[PDB]
Symmetry: D2
Subunit: 647 residues, 4 copies
């Protein structure tokens, strides 16, 4: 639909407050909201309504009227569910290790937020003091430690650990930061510290808690949120690769989408890239009288299908996470009746994770092909061998990254296979079909991580590639006239009263380019002597009817190259002398892509790399720098940059 783009969605999510308290009313909770609560420690509370309180209280009352095994049964439903694996002791912990078998804290916080929001719909019949137990945990930084695996997503077990924690189970353990450091204390031990009192689960109040898809919906919401970002970064990387490659903006022309193949997201993607490329002095906007490969040229038709899936996933997950009661059985109250269904079958969130993971693998394949092309000397239209600043003979700057990019891409491929086709006949066959939503959600989450390493690698590389390209442009700017000059100083007199000027200038220059594009692997000196050497053979053809010794041309050849090698060395020192805030790239880069350049180059401190050898020094590794770009993506810091350049 040409109304609501991924960007609209990202801006909405990014607008979510982290300070103001989030109010759960059972219907307006959105994806940006759950993410702010899970990761940004946003305060959370069941909306101060009365309507909400009444329907809640009414649900409970309707049940009270239909005291013994009611509580006992709950204990029996919680017992068999606390069956997951977790480190038995703290002795197993090690530096940077220890909690691998536990669900990420943000997933648990997001799960509790979604758990409460749905219980406010007055269908579950669980006391308001129980929902409050959960919001207090969230507001006091108390997060239950729950096993990573064990659920088939009909999320009974992980949810039970949450219930056990609030109900103060003896073996229940929780996580919490106690001024300065983080600790893992027992449930009743943590609650004691914050003056919180353990709740006591009553009639059917246990199924109303352990039933549901809150844990899946939570991790899935975190994953879709991260994937949107990666999607927009991919598009930004495309625009910047079009620039570094000196490609064509025309592939993103409205006629090639809006008109001829009106897929709303093909239009959306082409529109975004078109926008990013506007005002670019790197990319080509017109031609007068040429190829440009699929990685760049077919990028909208490649990413477009993926984007609609991500937009679709967003529709599904906002309904799932903010407007659905996934418990069972459910009460109708106003109609005085209980219904037995299966709203706990998280096939909806599983379906979004399966589709997103395949999409994450398609985005990675696209960007990999663009990046590997740009890193291929015989394909990147002139750029230095491995994006090395100095002589390639002792510099292979990005070769390893080119390799790492393939490694990430391969892994995304395997990760992309479906999880939902591996359903087993669980629970004495009563749960013969289960969604496997959290397992799918977990796989998609790893794919986000792997794509992030790939895209952080691509960003690092294009930056370096456009700086180099900026250097080529600075050089060309001055060498263009210099060629004309050194020509006349050596041939003007050699032949006057002829047309041996406008022609020799046009053919020499046309021959120089032709050869220099497939000689970008040569070290500086040999490259230029090779260039004009070929250029000489061109003068011999235009100036056939002229009086000149072969030593009178060989002098023009050694002088032309000499100037080129001296020029190039000049432009280079100028660049490495000026701070990045003054980079020559900032005068060719589009105003919008210039925003990401500055973010990485200025705010993240990762600069262009000269080359250990040349510098005669081993500087902070490339990896240490890629790692910094990677971390900006995982923390989300880059999100606003992306929004700002695409808004």
């Amino acid at each position: 639909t040409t109304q609501v783009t991924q960007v609209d969605i990202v801006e909405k999510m990014l607008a979510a407050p982290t300070d103001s308290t989030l109010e759960l009313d059972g219907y307006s909770l959105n994806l940006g909201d759950v993410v702010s609560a899970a990761r940004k420690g946003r305060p959370v509370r069941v909306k101060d309504s009365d309507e909400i309180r009444s329907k809640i209280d009414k649900s409970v009352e309707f049940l009270r009227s239909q005291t013994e095994d009611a509580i006992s049964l709950q204990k029996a439903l919680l017992e068999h569910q606390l069956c997951g694996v977790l480190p038995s002791s703290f002795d197993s912990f090690r530096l940077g290790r220890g909690l691998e078998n536990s669900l990420p804290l943000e997933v648990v916080r997001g799960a509790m937020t979604i758990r409460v929001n749905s219980l406010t719909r007055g269908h579950s019949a669980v006391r308001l003091v129980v929902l409050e137990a959960l919001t207090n945990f969230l507001n006091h930084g108390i997060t239950p430690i729950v096993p990573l695996r064990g659920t088939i997503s009909x999320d009974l077990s992980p949810l039970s650990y949450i219930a056990a924690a609030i109900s103060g189970h003896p073996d229940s353990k929780v996580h919490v930061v106690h001024e300065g450091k983080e600790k893992i204390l027992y449930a009743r031990e943590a609650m004691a510290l914050f003056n919180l009192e353990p709740v006591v689960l009553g009639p059917k109040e246990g199924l109303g808690l352990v039933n549901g898809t809150a844990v899946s919906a939570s991790m899935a919401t975190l994953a879709l949120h991260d994937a949107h970002m990666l999607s927009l970064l991919s598009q930004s990387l495309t625009a910047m690769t079009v620039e570094a490659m000196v490609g064509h903006a025309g592939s993103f022309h409205p006629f090639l989408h809006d008109v001829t193949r009106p897929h709303p997201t093909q239009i959306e993607v082409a529109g975004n890239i078109r926008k990013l490329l506007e005002g670019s002095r790197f990319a080509v906007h017109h031609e007068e009288e040429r190829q440009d490969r699929y990685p760049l040229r077919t990028s909208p038709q490649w990413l477009g299908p993926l984007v609609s899936d991500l937009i679709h996933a967003h529709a599904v997950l906002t309904i799932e996470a903010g407007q659905s009661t996934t418990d069972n059985p459910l009460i109708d109250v106003e109609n005085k009746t209980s219904h037995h269904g299966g709203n706990f079958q998280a096939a909806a969130v599983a379906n979004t994770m399966e589709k997103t993971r395949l999409g994450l693998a398609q985005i990675g394949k696209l960007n990999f092909t663009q990046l590997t092309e740009m890193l291929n000397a015989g394909m990147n239209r002139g750029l230095p061998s491995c994006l090395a600043a100095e002589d390639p003979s002792l510099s292979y700057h990005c070769k390893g990254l080119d390799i790492a990019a393939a490694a990430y891409t391969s892994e995304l491929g395997h990760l992309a296979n479906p999880v939902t086709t591996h359903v087993q006949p669980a629970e004495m066959a009563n749960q013969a079909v289960n969604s496997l939503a959290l397992i799918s959600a977990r796989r998609t989450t790893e794919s986000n991580d792997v794509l992030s390493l790939l895209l952080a690698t691509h960003l690092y590389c294009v930056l370096q590639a456009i700086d180099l390209r900026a250097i080529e442009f600075e050089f060309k700017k001055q060498f263009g006239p210099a060629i004309v000059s050194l020509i006349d100083q050596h041939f003007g007199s050699a032949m006057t009263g002829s047309n041996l000027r406008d022609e020799l200038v046009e053919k020499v220059n046309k021959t120089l380019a032709k050869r220099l594009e497939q000689t970008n692997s040569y070290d500086l000196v040999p490259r230029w002597h090779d260039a004009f050497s070929f250029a000489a053979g061109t003068v011999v053809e235009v100036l056939s009817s002229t009086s000149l010794s072969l030593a009178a041309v060989n002098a023009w050849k050694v002088a032309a190259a000499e100037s080129a090698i001296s020029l190039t060395r000049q432009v280079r020192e100028t660049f490495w002398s000026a701070a990045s805030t003054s980079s020559p790239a900032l005068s060719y880069l589009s105003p919008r892509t210039q925003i990401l350049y500055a973010f990485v180059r200025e705010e993240l401190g990762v600069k262009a790399r000269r080359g250990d050898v040349f510098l005669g020094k081993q500087e902070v590794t490339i990896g240490s720098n890629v790692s910094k770009i990677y971390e900006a993506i995982k923390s989300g810091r880059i999100n606003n940059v992306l929004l700002k350049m695409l808004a």
Copy 2:
């Protein structure tokens, strides 16, 4: 969205005329249209309009104004494309074998239809006579033979074999039916049989003919079409299994979907099933004081997500097949400019196919779990062992089908893995990313096929099950009172003046049912003696205070069992004596599901099966029957009976 459902789409598709000529205008082509013209030999033609003819002629005229190599180049860009593999001779052909390496006929006709439509948009710049070359071919049943494999769906090769066929190529075979029998002639050797004249491609009139998605879009349209039907059949099968299982309709109540988890497609599927179940005597509609399993109870939330993808896929494909120019370059006549993009990257159609194939596996899994549960004596609530009409000892009716069901399901799982993750650096890396659309379409088509096998098998089995259920019902109808009769005849006098009446009849009936549930694998005689034998134990409890000999009750037992044995044998013969058109099943089945039962039991001839042993003969095999149902699905005959019961 709650507007437009899968049935709304199917209805619209099945409304596509087969006789009325189809006029292509570059924007109105439907998926119902495309299908009628490819599988229903519906006449096609480029709409008789001046507008169409105008822009067509203009696109050409624009080109003609920017001599020799123009045609040559197109004899080059057609030479290297005719590189697929196909039987070199007819000496290879065998009985029911020979064209495995050729593209299905209907796919070619559809591609032909789609090719033309897109050409009418005037972005191509190809003569109208050429478009007519294809239409004539379609109108005369002239379908070229094209290799099954070879393209990476950037579909150059497949299309080339279509061009060379209407361009009269010496080594360009085709397929047609010459009154009575079909044959495989050569291009000009078939066109000179229908008065057709082979066209000659002019300037860039080859690329505008071989650059496109036509072939993929065609096969994808046929696969999505078939998948829509299978998707409806799966819901029908769900309803009928709820009946055969004497399950609960409450799982499809609007409160458990429309109100609690408002996913449009979960509501859509729940509604469909609720409908089909309305007025069913088999399914339960309300209790009064259970445990339906997930295969039945969670079907809406299981199928809902898949349904939304098929509906999303329809939106993608309609725009692709009926409103997009997937060629390159593209001309903007009313702007005097040529555009170089990449609308040939069929990622859009591959996306639909990838998601559809996964959906087909999810459907298969659901129906399999339903079917296998219904075939499990320990889970099917009292149905006969293997759905055998007579004694189980010498009857294992659907044993093989349960196993075949698992076989088809397993195959569906492996088929569902993605194809788009196996992209290769094709064509000197220029085509580093390619959609693989046709290959994916091909795989999805195979899943359509295997699901058809699974659903045909499920249909066969559910039918036999409800008849057997009908018989159980008729029996329980007459046996109920019989029990109350023989009870007095033997007791009554045994203890008059007390309450040993209402109680003895309740408890005996109750204990009689609890033991029959798990004894449905016994023959008939021992089964019934087992039942009342257990009952007699209940008698000893109720009639504790009474004067009766152990032989007095043993007489009651044998009598009861004898009555039951005779009774069941009676209700059976009554069933097998009456034509299916008078089957007692029609008295319990819902009005809507009865339609499917009648379609199979009558129009198909596939009747219930009593048993080869019993009947002392070997009648047409189970398979031959299942094949009938399968053949009804593949031909599309069952399509209107599906719309009929759901519309």
Copy 3:
């Protein structure tokens, strides 16, 4: 182990007689045997021995001593098994279509052969007359029609259709050839045409006939057989590509395998390639002072692992197909005891198929990367653009095949995913684990097929490449001196008494080669003018101190280029005028690889291609030719030419 190689196995298989009758004795059956009897209509029979007949009769006699229901039960355990799907009528059949849902003929014959062999072991307890029922069927070309799908390879159904065919079932069709043409008759309607008498199964003589792996083992044997050939063809293709690429044979030196990484199969493959490369004029054998890519250089370590699996698979299958009773129960006559186990769980054969299918994808990938590199003008060391004989402008010879290659490879990837991970809780859960052997065998067979398409395409392309290489060689042979000639004719006098001779000839030749490497995409005229134009620049350097006009050298340039243009055009016509049996390629190709070249260029008729444009005509398409090579692989005709060049 270093004993027994893949070739040793192939040799042994291709040594299986087709005329000499095959005698089954329950322990000697080979995989070469099984194949000859299923694909080579080789006569089969239960070895004429008393021992065999003794234990057979004894197994029966043991049973007969522990009347009615005995036969009935077997009419029940055959009823429910004939549940597969197959065309209900012949009105469905079409040209080259009709039996897609039936098991391949050869598979049935093989299963038939294997069934019998296992029965001769006397563990079954089935009459000898029954075994003869099957042998006769095989000897008379009577092959029953059995449904393609249905079994989970615990292969009850498929086999049942074989029993019912020789047991004379009314609804049990079969296939046979009645002098001249093949037909599909009924059981007794075909046996009463060959004087055969339908057998009647007695006590437990049905289970001992339908319980087994026969069908899976059969298809797996045929697939492994084909895979062995493909595996050898892949190594042959590797060697020929090293030639066409003028690569290095050093990568196959024994020190880089036998000594440094002693993996038996890496040594085995390295040896095979080393061999084929012995005495090659194309491949380099030693330097004297490079960079072969992994597709060529790492082929032994890439194919080695896969080869070991095929050899391991052979060991598994031979024991399975020729020395195992996969029925149940099983009788130990000389111990008076019946055993209940599970030798019908074909996990063994599924294992072979799963690993073989993955291997087929690894092979395809390797050969694809080799082929696509050879087709890349920028990587193929000087070969013509798309392997076009004439000017590239109007010739893109193998463009379509590079793309088809990627297409086949992508398909191989998806096919390679496992099938054994999709096991379902079949048959009321009694068969909770089942091998899925036949389904896996079926998939592996398809990979055999698609790899054949890929390798046939690779073979076609390498052939064209070496001819073109041969032409380059013949040209370089005569051009070398020509350069040294025209150099003196124009220079020499220009500067006598100096060293401007040995130097000018070296540097010019050197710079002439460096520019030709990357100019192989130019037509011919501009190409050569481009070359010496660059050369002239080198002249100006060497002949710096000499009296010569710019028109003096420009004369040399044009002269040189003119010479080259004429020369190349001469060596070309010399090539196209001589029959292939006299192709200059035979002078450079290794003795062993020449065998493949001759097999294709002669016996197959597939000649090099000059170009439709140039020749001013449209000759048999590339595809029709590739199809020939493909057909040679499928028929197994190329098998002996493979053994011939490797033996």
Copy 4:
């Protein structure tokens, strides 16, 4: 948490052991003092953090 993006210590220790064992075959041409650098790391519980 913290070291998820690093290879497990045992893999690195096993890698160093295998690295040395193969360098003793006299095909690599790497000084013995270099192989010793690796065994000392292993014997002193020094394990390089690797991505």
